[PDB]
């Protein structure tokens, strides 16, 4: 529908992967209807985080929240040239909810500093 080409490099390192109409309530129609609703729900579910973090229309957006070393103690050579995006998630999956809240407020405080900056 979109693409599973992102998934091509699921075993590659993090540095390599990153670099008709009419509705009929038949058993297949109800099946194919929820698939259409379940797609736009899961799509906007991710797309509203990108918007609220100030990253809509971006694939790679840099933030302003420093990397708290308690989230991971590994080196940049141990991450981007060793771990895969699939296993790196399992190591950091505890702090993902703790990180998503910091990127959410780093964008919020950046917005009020701009409304004071452009007022000159």
């Amino acid at each position: 529908a979109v693409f599973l080409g992102f998934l091509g490099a699921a075993g590659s390192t993090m540095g390599a992967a990153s670099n008709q109409h009419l509705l009929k309530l038949t058993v297949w129609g109800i099946k194919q209807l929820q698939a259409r609703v379940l797609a736009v729900e899961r799509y906007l579910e991710v797309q509203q985080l990108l918007g609220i973090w100030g990253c809509s229309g971006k694939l790679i957006c840099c933030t302003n929240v420093p990397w708290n070393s308690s989230w991971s103690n590994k080196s940049l050579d141990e991450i981007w040239n060793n771990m895969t995006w699939l296993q790196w998630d399992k190591e950091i999956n505890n702090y993902t909810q703790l990180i998503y809240r910091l990127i959410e407020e780093s964008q919020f405080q950046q917005e009020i500093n701009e409304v004071e900056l452009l007022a000159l």
Partner: nanobody, 128 residues
């Protein structure tokens, strides 16, 4: 983690062609190079060569260019990131100069400048 248990400390006589095994545990066997380095009793530590358990590519030392046969059988998957492979290595016209402890070590990373660097060493097999 990971452990690269080696073969047995078997000693033959000059002219033989002993094989040394090196089976791994606790890590993806295909994701890292295997490396063999000996420590001759009358020489400095000598690097012999590495092979890629994934690509199947070899690169050895000039002093072992036509004297060493090293191979690897495929890995037996255990989980999404653990495998159980094995690494074998032979010598051709073996003499008494090849006497010493032999080591097998796995690569440092799987990308970058120091990809194959012998990071995790095994246990050692004493020869003739």
């Amino acid at each position: 983690q990971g452990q690269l248990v080696q073969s047995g400390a078997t000693t033959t006589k000059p002219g033989s062609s002993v094989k040394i095994s090196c089976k791994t545990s606790g890590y993806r066997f295909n994701f890292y190079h295997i490396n063999w380095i000996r420590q001759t009793a009358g020489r400095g530590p000598e690097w012999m060569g590495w092979i890629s358990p994934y690509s199947g590519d070899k690169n050895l030392a000039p002093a072992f260019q036509d004297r060493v046969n090293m191979t690897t059988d495929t890995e037996v998957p255990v989980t999404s990131f653990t495998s159980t492979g094995a690494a074998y290595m032979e010598i051709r016209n073996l003499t008494s100069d090849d006497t010493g402890t032999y080591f097998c070590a796995k690569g440092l990373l799987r990308d970058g400048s120091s990809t194959w660097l012998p990071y995790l060493w095994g246990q050692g097999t004493l020869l003739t």
